[PDB]
Amino acid sequence: MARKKVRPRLIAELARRVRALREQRERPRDSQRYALDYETMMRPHSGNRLPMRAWADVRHESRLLQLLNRLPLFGLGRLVTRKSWLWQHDEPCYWRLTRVRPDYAAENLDHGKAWGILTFKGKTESEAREIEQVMYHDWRLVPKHEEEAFTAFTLVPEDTPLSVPYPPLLRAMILAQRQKYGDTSTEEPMLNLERARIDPWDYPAKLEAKTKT
């Protein structure tokens, strides 16, 4: 806070500026960043090792831009799916590519940021978005003829009861609370789950920064 003799620290500012600058200038190309040593299963850049459960899927499968580099327009309007989704969810889960912006420092051109519109468990989101976990090796491309076989969706309704009992004590508290104010109605108190809907963990999160309203 304010004490009348307080010294003017200059270098505090200098280091902020200089650090931000050396950050922007040395900001790593994601070509080298997610680069992976397949023998040791170790990132050169971060020195990080990959989790045991991801090993096989790393050896045997391909990252997104590995399947998008050999596409003619670099794969616009194409449908893409993820191995994990195919194993867990029997309903269709795909990404439709809106933009693709590869990273060219790469000799083999395997890396880059993507965008699109997502269908998960058959439900479709109405907006464009940046796709998440591109660098992963789970990615697969669906062929043109099979496109209309995957996009084929059998629409089924949801059977989970809209309401459930309150937990035993809480129910008692509510009962007694309404007896006290002279409400005689013995209609069971019910807990309404309409807004308690949550997406399974597989559902990809938006990388886009939030606009504050």
Partner 1 sequence: RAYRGGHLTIRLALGGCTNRPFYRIVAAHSKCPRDGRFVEQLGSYDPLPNSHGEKLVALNFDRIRHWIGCGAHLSKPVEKLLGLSGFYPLHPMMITNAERLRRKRAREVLLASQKTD
Site for RNA, rule CB under 7 A:
1-5, 7-12, 14-15, 17-19, 21, 25, 34, 43, 46, 48-54, 57-58, 61, 73, 76, 84, 98-101, 132-133, 135-138, 201, 210, 212-213
The secondary structure of residue 37, as a DSSP letter, is B
* Cβ within 8 Å of residue 173, ≥6 positions away: none
CB 163 within 8 A of CB 190: yes
Residue 169 touching partner 1 (CB under 8 A):
yes
**From 73, 105, 173, 205, residue interacting with partner 1 (rule: CB under 8 A):** 173
Calpha distance 167→131 (Å, rounded): 40
Task: Kindly tell me which of 52 and 176 has the beta carbon lying closer to RNA.
Answer: 52
From candidates 48, 124, 163, 177, binder to Mg ion by CB under 5 A: 48
Other Cβ atoms closer than 10 A to 199: 11
Query: Among residues 152 and 172, whose Cβ is nearest to partner 1?
Result: 172
CA distance 141 to 81: 6
Contact between 40 and Mg ion by CB under 5 A: the answer reads: no
CA Rg value for the chain: 26
* Contacts to partner 1 by CB under 8 A: 167-170, 173
